[PDB]
Amino acid sequence: EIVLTQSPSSLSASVGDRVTITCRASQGIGDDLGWYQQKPGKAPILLIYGTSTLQSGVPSRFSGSGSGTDFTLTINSLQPEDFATYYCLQDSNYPLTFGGGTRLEIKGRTVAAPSVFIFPPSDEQLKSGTASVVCLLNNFYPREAKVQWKVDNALQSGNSQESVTEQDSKDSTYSLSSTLTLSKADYEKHKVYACEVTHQGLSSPVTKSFNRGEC
Amino acid sequence: EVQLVESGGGVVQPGRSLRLSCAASGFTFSSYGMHWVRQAPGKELEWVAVISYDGSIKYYADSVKGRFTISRDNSKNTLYLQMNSLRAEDTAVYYCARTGEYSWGQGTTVTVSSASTKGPSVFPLAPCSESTAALGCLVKDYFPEPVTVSWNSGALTSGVHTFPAVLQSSGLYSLSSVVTVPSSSLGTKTYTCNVDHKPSNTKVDKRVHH
Numbered sequence: 001e002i003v004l005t006q007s008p009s010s011l012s013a014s015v016g017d018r019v020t021i022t023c024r025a026s027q028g029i030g031d032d033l034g035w036y037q038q039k040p041g042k043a044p045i046l047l048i049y050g051t052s053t054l055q056s057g058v059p060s061r062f063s064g065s066g067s068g069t070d071f072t073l074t075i076n077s078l079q080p081e082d083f084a085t086y087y088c089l090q091d092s093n094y095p096l097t098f099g100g101g102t103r104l105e106i107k108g109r110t111v112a113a114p115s116v117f118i119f120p121p122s123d124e125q126l127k128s129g130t131a132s133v134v135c136l137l138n139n140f141y142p143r144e145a146k147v148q149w150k151v152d153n154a155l156q157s158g159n160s161q162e163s164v165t166e167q168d169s170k171d172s173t174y175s176l177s178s179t180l181t182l183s184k185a186d187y188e189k190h191k192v193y194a195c196e197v198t199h200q201g202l203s204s205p206v207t208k209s210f211n212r213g214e215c
Numbered sequence: 216e217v218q219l220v221e222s223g224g225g226v227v228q229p230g231r232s233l234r235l236s237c238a239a240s241g242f243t244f245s246s247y248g249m250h251w252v253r254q255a256p257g258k259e260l261e262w263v264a265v266i267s268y269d270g271s272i273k274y275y276a277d278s279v280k281g282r283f284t285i286s287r288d289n290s291k292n293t294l295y296l297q298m299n300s301l302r303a304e305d306t307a308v309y310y311c312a313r314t315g316e317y318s319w320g321q322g323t324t325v326t327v328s329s330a331s332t333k334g335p336s337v338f339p340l341a342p343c344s345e346s347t348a349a350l351g352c353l354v355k356d357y358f359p360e361p362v363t364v365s366w367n368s369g370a371l372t373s374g375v376h377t378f379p380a381v382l383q384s385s386g387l388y389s390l391s392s393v394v395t396v397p398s399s400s401l402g403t404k405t406y407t408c409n410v411d412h413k414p415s416n417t418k419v420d421k422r423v424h425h
Contacts, residue, residue: 094274
């Protein structure tokens with residue numbers, strides 16, 4: 001198959017900015033490369049069919065460029081309706097190929113540090129023989145953040161699952177959740193449960209922690 | 216307007232079979248050619264199958280060949296995809312595509328897994344002991360998707376964050392729903408989360424105490 005490498009992964013722009021996204025074809029695909037727009041929970045919208053041939057129903061804001069291996073989607077005068085994830089596609093030969101995707105983020109007006117909270121396991125869940133420690137990072141920007149679980153100063157890994165909301169469209173922020181999951185037996189062997197967060201908005205890494213019995 | 220409506224997806228066990236249908240409308244179905252595509256949770260889209268206008272030439276992907284078979288009934292305006300020996304990798308939402316020498320449908324979701332229908336357990340997320348305070352509910356150990364969460368019967372939407380569910384190693388789903396409120400409000404306003412899981416007909420309201 002032919003690999004379509006899309007650059008970059010994520011990308012921040014403002015309403016009005018002129019922005020362009022690159023798709024590269026591992027070998028020649030000719031003029032037969034198109035561009036799609038997908039918003040969360042929606043179906044992909046056909047922006048462009050092949051190279052620069054714009055399609056009915058799409059504003060002239062959009063433009064295709066390139067030919068051969070290198071191609072580019074360019075959007076003039078960004079509007080709030082165009083913030084989505086964009087995928088390049090080629091139907092030159094089978095199998096059909098898609099790019100890694102470029103998510104078009106709202107360029108955050110300014111840097112916002114997360115509000116960090118830590119939730120101990122509930123007693124009733126401790127009944128069930130399991131324990132879920134939750135760490136919440138609230139309304140931060142940019143999206144890049146690092147959450148590290150510590151259990152009696154021991155750095156955890158492979159132990160937790162992370163979840164991110166879609167970018168809030170009022171304040172352009174994100175929220176993040178990190179769940180650490182132990183058994184009751186495991187959870188009762190240790191005392192201090194800590195969540196350490198590194199983010200651009202925080203000059204130093206913030207640690208929110210609790211100890212067993214405290215709650 | 217040209218359109219395609221997929222159906223036939225659902226929750227299925229591994230090794231079992233399932234056939235999707237795609238009702239085509241608004242265009243000459245017998246003349247145009249059709250494609251199958253799929254998107255896994257979070258990943259990019261992936262092509263899987265292609266058929267000609269008459270059903271002559273057919274080509275799949277490597278991960279699907281020998282198990283997936285494409286067809287079309289030109290009299291009923293329908294494109295078919297029979298998927299046999301389904302594997303966890305096949306879990307995705309499958310879209311129906313037209314081609315020109317394009318237009319994509321809503322897609323139907325196929326979830327392959329050995330887990331059974333199970334309602335969630337709801338647990339309070341309350342902090343241990345600042346201007347803003349946080350509460351929530353943990354909706355854990357449920358399948359299949361989805362579950363819906365509201366706060367105080369929908370009256371409390373400001374400051375609410377219901378995270379996308381994650382799939383746990385047990386094959387069950389889990390999510391959290393949190394709300395951040397002014398720290399003074401605690402003690403006179405009440406905060407209860409409402410959890411709905413239609414597949415198991417599970418409806419639970421839990422009031423979270425700080």
